[PDB]
């Protein structure tokens, strides 16, 4: 058996697999070596996974995660995995997870629309080019946080529909003042903004929300996708925003003259296939 | 004599005055009760002002500052002033400073374009209406930080002119990676973004920079100014961004059918007049 894990801001997905056969899947909290020390990662692993995961003969562990983006950060995660499982562990970024999960050994443009957003050209083996996403303030166009940022900007200006404003304040138990406090003074403001992506998804019948999604999705295409040779290679998407707003994403694709026929919630299914070759 | 002080992110201006006559002016660091305790404010005062300020018979002290926006925050500043000067001290916000400095006892729309941005309707006595600015992430349209945010977004995407990108990296001794670090991990990211407003001002001959200013100034008008009865009252501006980019601001005014003939660097001259009545 092998273990394949994919970690983002909201959770880690663990797949215990034999070849392409799923023995078990388990979710734990997100694990990010920029926010968590080696020991916290080890502890979160140790407390989150069932016993069967730790008693099982594993040939390798493939881990992909947000924040696994340098040699040093990959080491922290690797040390935890190696300590917890006593087996070869290979740590890569969430971006390479998207590329390999979406493309296998073919070439094309892989894009993530999740808490943040990301894109790359993948040559079937390595990432060859990677437009900088820029994070929740300076970029991450088309991401959950970008949506949340524009929505909350509109809430404070009273520009959004009253129904949405009232529902937002009630659901989150907030006032305008408390919004400022959360965004400017409390941990992980990006995650709170990105949570708005889930909130807004119930209100898609409103012109306001459709226009907000179209605007942010177009921005991702103009500022990220179209830096690549996007008319000459397949463009494939993964992530919670891409998945939940797949119809609007497809519409934006057609506006830019492309056919987006691959939109997946996560790269996990593709990663299981990839590590079976 | 009285003492009139106006405090923002970059500095405090102190005016020792008899009626409308300026005895002396001194600059110290900014003083903001959200970032500095009463004792730090007192110390910064005590170390920043000349002896003559402390030996002088003063009838009152009028202080206006960023962050002096609640009863409690005003108290902190007041306690410091009262301890340092042993005289009646009246603490108000930087917004009321703009209103009173720009309008005296007349009515109209007062706007600030500085590190952040702000606007209000002033009835000649009190602020009657105040669109929420929203801060550097969710709003502050037309501010230095909004400029810096779009510029740096463009820098990371490689969309800005190469000359600007090279000059930015060299002047600030930064790389793309170090930019992320400053914005996401270091204190007062708003102040660093707002500093870009001064950097860009030397490059106004570039189409890119003109278009950036026009876009951000238009945004301030669409999302803030035009929430007020802006065709029926004078609109007056104060602040470093408004002052440095006065020609483009005036142009944006005309686009929205208004004549902006009052643009001041600071409200200080107006405040001296106001507190002489």
Residue numbers in the entry:
A (entry chain A), B (entry chain A): 2 to 278
Task: Copy text verbatim from the article accompanying this structure deposition.
Unlike other bacteria, the pathogenic Tannerella forsythia, a member of the red complex group of bacteria associated with the late stages of periodontitis, lacks biosynthetic pathways for MurNAc production and therefore obtains MurNAc from the environment. Sugar kinases play a crucial role in the MurNAc recycling process, activating the sugar molecules by phosphorylation. MurK and K1058 are two sugar kinases of the cell wall recycling system of T. forsythia, sharing a sequence identity of 44% and separated by a single PGN-scavenging operon within the genome. Structural and sequence data showed that MurK and K1058 both belong to the group of ribonuclease H-like kinases and are members of the ASKHA (acetate and sugar kinase/hsc70/actin) superfamily.
